[PDB]
Amino acid sequence: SGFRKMAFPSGKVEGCMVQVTCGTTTLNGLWLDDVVYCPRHVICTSEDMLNPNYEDLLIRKSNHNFLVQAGNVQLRVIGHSMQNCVLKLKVDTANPKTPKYKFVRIQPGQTFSVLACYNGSPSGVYQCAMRPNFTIKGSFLNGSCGSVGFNIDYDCVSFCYMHHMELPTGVHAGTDLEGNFYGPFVDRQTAQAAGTDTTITVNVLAWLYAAVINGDRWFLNRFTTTLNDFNLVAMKYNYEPLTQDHVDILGPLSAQTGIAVLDMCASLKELLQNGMNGRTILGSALLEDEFTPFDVVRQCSGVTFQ
Amino acid sequence: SGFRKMAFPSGKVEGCMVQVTCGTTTLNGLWLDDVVYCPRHVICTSEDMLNPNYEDLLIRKSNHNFLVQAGNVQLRVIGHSMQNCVLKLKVDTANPKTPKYKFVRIQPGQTFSVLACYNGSPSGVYQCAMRPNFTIKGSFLNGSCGSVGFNIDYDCVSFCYMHHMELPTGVHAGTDLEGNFYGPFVDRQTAQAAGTDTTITVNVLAWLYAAVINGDRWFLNRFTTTLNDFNLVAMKYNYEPLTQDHVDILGPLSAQTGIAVLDMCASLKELLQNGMNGRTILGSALLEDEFTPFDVVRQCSGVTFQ
Numbered sequence A, B: 001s002g003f004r005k006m007a008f009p010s011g012k013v014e015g016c017m018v019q020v021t022c023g024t025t026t027l028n029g030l031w032l033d034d035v036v037y038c039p040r041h042v043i044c045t046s047e048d049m050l051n052p053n054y055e056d057l058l059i060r061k062s063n064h065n066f067l068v069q070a071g072n073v074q075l076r077v078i079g080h081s082m083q084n085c086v087l088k089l090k091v092d093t094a095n096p097k098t099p100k101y102k103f104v105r106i107q108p109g110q111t112f113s114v115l116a117c118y119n120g121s122p123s124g125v126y127q128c129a130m131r132p133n134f135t136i137k138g139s140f141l142n143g144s145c146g147s148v149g150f151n152i153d154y155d156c157v158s159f160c161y162m163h164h165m166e167l168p169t170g171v172h173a174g175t176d177l178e179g180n181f182y183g184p185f186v187d188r189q190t191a192q193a194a195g196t197d198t199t200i201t202v203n204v205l206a207w208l209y210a211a212v213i214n215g216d217r218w219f220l221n222r223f224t225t226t227l228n229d230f231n232l233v234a235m236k237y238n239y240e241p242l243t244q245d246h247v248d249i250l251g252p253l254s255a256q257t258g259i260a261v262l263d264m265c266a267s268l269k270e271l272l273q274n275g276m277n278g279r280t281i282l283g284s285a286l287l288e289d290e291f292t293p294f295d296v297v298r299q300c301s302g303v304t305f306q
């Protein structure tokens, strides 16, 4: 028993992190096979960031201008190209520690682990959700860019995020591993506004099911409700609307606890209107939305990986 | 910027986890050099747990009764001994992935990372604190015993915890790597009561300093206070008393924020008496005590490891 915000084990990713230096800037890169991936703003100076023309700046760089280091081993760049907002550096040595991997573009509300790195070296690991406004609320300092987010399925590492920037508001924005930003952001030093950050309703329900599995049952009430009636209340509190796909995804948790989704929705409705009255659920005084239904099943059943 | 409950990277520990089987029971073991460490209750049946005589049960076991597996590689046990509540299985092959390591017995209030494992395979990683009553509030299912807690300093893994049991109350108890339980618990299926679980005051202060570093300053008030006056209020709310050693440890955070410890204590005092009024600090509606002052400095300065 117990419930924790659990990250994936990071060992398979630790062996892929390298340090990338171009001119004076030093960021993290991700070394898979014989290619290193890193944010293209590694080629910028502090002055270029206000309005960078990446194509023009990249012309002034040659293969020998990029210094890639893996601990103390040194890689020779024999080819470079820009793909959207990431640089692909072809090196001479394939990474012997390359795991079974895949590049995936996640959807808002999905969760992943971040391996925060500085100078190519791992600093720590934590779990987070992609917010509905395509930001993440991470922990990143200068030099952490190029750190990656990932999931592990079976023996395969699915890379889904590379960190690029901190917004003036303190939240974080980045790309998939093909270099397409999540959200409308651009890699330029200019005022950018994220949208409204709504609560991931299907995740909150999954976490309420986790609470019941672990013995916190006080919020379970007599009422029930309808999907339309619930969504009308949810949207007033900036909760994402619930759809039938969401109800389908919660089916196995319903089956294990004997509590129907709409009944659970009626408990949530009352929690939104009346608050929590100074009580807690799974050790929290706020409704938590960084666990997907799959995260709950995974943790409550003990799924392991390679 | 940002602040997250961050675990250490787990790769160095993942390569040390093995599966240990004796008779019908299968737990996790920790393979360092040519020794495997595991909970001694691996030699018990479900019936033995009510009142086990470990010395007598261990007599009925020989070296070939223990099956240790590392993925698909198999270790041959050539010597076994009991040290307090852990078994030390001498094997024929030294672990090639043995890191620089150390065994350490931590003090209540210190934090560490747990690598939750099942059948010798990693499932996830999370950070937790040793509570003042020597329990931890983990996430553990059947088969997770022998999972270990650890810290990383420089290039050295400091093992400080091995999981042994779940109390009837849902909290977790275990030993150091010499097999001495933390707290008064015994590895036997009997009703055991943990003491009162108090809040780790010095950690709460460190986290308030983290909040100020990250821009949450609303709780900062006009008043100040004295150590004696603060402790008188803290003990009413089951907070650990603050000592001068605690004030000394917080010195660097005081220097970086320009806020004196006693001034920060006066803010906490008002938070304890008046509550939080539906506001949050670093995304939480509760005062958080699972960050040590060192965790805050580490995260807010970007310390890396091997």
Ligand SMILES: *CC(=O)N1CCN(Cc2cccc3ccccc23)CC1
Binding pocket: A027, A041, A049, A140, A141, A142, A143, A144, A145, A146, A163, A164, A165, A166, A187, A188, A189, A190
């Ligand atoms: C994450 C990291 O290591 N850095 C982030 C900031 N900086 C370059 C950079 C990249 C994208 C946008 C942006 C906007 C303003 C200032 C700097 C920016 C390098 C280090």
Ligand SMILES: *CC(=O)N1CCN(Cc2cccc3ccccc23)CC1
Binding pocket: B027, B041, B049, B140, B141, B142, B143, B144, B145, B146, B163, B164, B165, B166, B187, B188, B189, B190
């Ligand atoms: C953690 C784990 O894998 N297990 C814990 C429970 N069990 C054996 C065991 C060990 C210590 C105390 C105790 C008390 C009651 C029941 C079982 C107990 C094996 C699996």
